[model samples]
Target: GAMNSSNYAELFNNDIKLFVDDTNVYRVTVHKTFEGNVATKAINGCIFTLNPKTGHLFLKIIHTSVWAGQKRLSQLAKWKTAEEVSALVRSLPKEEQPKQIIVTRKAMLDPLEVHMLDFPNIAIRPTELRLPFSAAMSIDKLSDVVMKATEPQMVLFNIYDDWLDRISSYTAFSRLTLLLRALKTNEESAKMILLSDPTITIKSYHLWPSFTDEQWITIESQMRDLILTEYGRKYNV
Candidate 1:
């Protein structure tokens, strides 16, 4: 149950993740504790499928319709059984396939226990999503954004708030920029600051089901590579 710190932190991804995710955990705990097991388990089903790296819940109750092309009449009843969820996982990379996405009936006994859900269904999509262009946070300001800006400015704010409102993403980007600016000013490699966090590909949360596990794997792997590259080059070197 008490998984290693690294393992647990892996799930949280960042301090922001811990905060954002804990809210869901607390809400689910409440539902499980009082609203009943069914309510709580339902929340778990959705939250558990979230890609910790991107901080996106892949199979959202609302977004189901976007991927499926039709909305179910209700969220609670539209449960994806283990087989169905498994199909989503199988949509991942070929190498990671045959991953069993479990739909359990029981409220887990050990709150801390982590199940190693394999993602065999993950299918790799050729990502056209280049790392988004962002200026140094210091180079930009809330005032510049709020005042002199165009249509893309709003999207920039939304992304910073949603995908990376916290210091982690900023810090990750800052350190990356520092290194890159030092090596080669204005280098695209500096943009790894934007690339490292898990992304929604700018898709709304309600539409996450449209993506496959392979999408998630590729996305996460790309992000990880960027992050690790920063470390390996700086500290490890």
Candidate 2:
């Protein structure tokens, strides 16, 4: 059966995602790799979770790693190492491999680093960005990470400039881009304006009923500075 508007919105939690046409439901779930006594190195276990009790299909792409010999000590050391993930993928028979891979969470910070983790064969895509502080980024540290990224597409937010400043340097900002803004209770924090090309898919996820016309001015003014002054016409922002 196809997903209706009411049930379609309800199934958007976790691995439950719907196709763009809302005609099908897709469940891409990974096994919980928490504190369990199951095999941590099983061929059919989770690809990049902490410690796997099992595995199904979803392989989360977070920026967490461990070493070859050392075992995890506690919750602080959760998440699998790059070698373990590579091994899990290698172990699976050719027919059982995933069609596409998803990279998200902290992994989006330095997608180059994640690429170097040697998931060489499979195509990787990063969703949802979590940029680090601008003040602390070293010259060689994520200095050109966004442009260096080879992913087919990326996901970013429009409400916060922290993410904009972090990714604005990349040339792909004008192409195949999407902006997701979370709604707020007031104009000061409401941030609901967009000034990029009309092609960018901008959508407000958490609508607060009254988006307000007054906030539009503040939002445009705030976004104008970021998209114009900060970005300038060089990158076509």
Candidate 3:
């Protein structure tokens, strides 16, 4: 069954949440696609939780070992049956719980959809993600609204583009950098965490092929210069 846009809108939080220091914190939940994105793959679990506003990320990865909640695992694992993932997510920190969760599953209900049926929060479909970007095509448009809007406590952006390479100049790459710069400039009032795209199968037939190691190195340099260095940010890992 398909849900309309208005039904999906009801899933998100509409009130601003502040930290003890008066920092604006947006609550967001993220789910993975096929193989998942770089950030999601870095985490070993079916469910990856990130509250960009708080800079708090958690992974509900399945493993043979049984450690408790919020503890870093020496090893980890992805999403399985609805019952399993549901129980795992329930164990997450109370403060980390999200009002709206983002998932990439487009066909048939996955673990998250079934579980959210029992939870108070709502699961946002991929089709529903377009509601925001459709309204803002450039940096200025997005920033203006983000800075001015007072209601709808928080919003989520499930941006996706897994392919990268040196064979061509990627306009998408530059656009992403632009958004990152804007977010960094408004860091005091904004938050974000990068994650990987879900696995794609025949998803490969793109006219532009995916990046190789060397090609990625070249593109990575561009990202560092255009994104990180431009914002005076550094990476240790």
Candidate 4:
């Protein structure tokens, strides 16, 4: 039988063993795979705790995927079925674990979604709206259009054919910083600006030096986003 999403959850429950005293965080590598030469992995920081009110076990999972680059970091918080919890307890190393383990099921929180939710006044350009650009012109013109549309405090520029991937990280970072600095220097109008690449992968196996940890932190802080996909659907951060 083809495994449904719920089956994955059930399988997870049936395979794992947890105890009440294990309420502290457990760092787990949930999945790992390779496609030809490229590799991908999903890591989870999980905490299993009992609900004081309902006597149910609450499982909170913070997930982050790493491929050529790390991305799609989010939290999954949920309660599972009692049967599932019991099954989880039954799988515990210690037979006495059942006395302490509580059962659960979860929500995925995306940072972009959170920002939109927090700022209801944000202006969203139609998804179908396309902003054309060329190598000959400056991105400054596009930035100007975004700046002139002053009502929206936040704006997203989804560049489907971005050149970031084509260039080195240093050049990409420089361009990004230049744009962000220019925008900030102007009116402080674009408070939460997102510049996204629909098709860009910072390959882990690149011959050139990739963005450093500090650089990634800086890029993310400034809302530079990328979606990475290798012979599969894109995963965004």
For lDDT, the strongest prediction is 3
Greater TM-score among 3 and 4 belongs to 3
Write candidate 3's Cα lDDT for 1-237 as tens digits: 333456543322342121111001111235566677532222111233333233222322232222235333322111232344456447657554554454423432453465557665544343333222211222332333344543322233322224322222124433343444544444322222111222311133221224454654554454445444435544542
For residue 70, give model 1's deviation from the true position in Å.
21
C-alpha displacement of 149 in model 1, angstroms? 35
Residue 169 lDDT, candidate 1, scale 0-100? 52
Error of 4 at 71 (Å): 37
Q: How do the residues 69-172 of candidate 1 rate in per-residue lDDT, one tens digit apiece? A: 33432332223223233444445565533222222222221121222235323221111212222222212232233224322211212222243443455443
Candidate 1 lowest-lDDT run of ten: 18-27
lDDT of 2 at 82: 35
Give the candidates in order of TM-score, highest first.
3, 1, 2, 4
CA lDDT scores, all candidates in order: 0.31, 0.29, 0.34, 0.30
Error of 4 at 89 (Å): 32
Pick by TM-score: 1 or 3, better one? 3
| lDDT (10s digit) by residue, model 4, range 4-53 | 33333322233222222121122234444554454334433333333222
Q: What is the lDDT of residue 38 in candidate 4?
A: 45
Candidate 2: tens digits of C-alpha lDDT, residues 89-183: 55668664433343334332233235335545554433333322121112121223322434322222222222333333121121111121111
Clashes of each: 20, 1, 12, 6
Off by over 4 Å in 2: 1-79, 106-121, 129-237
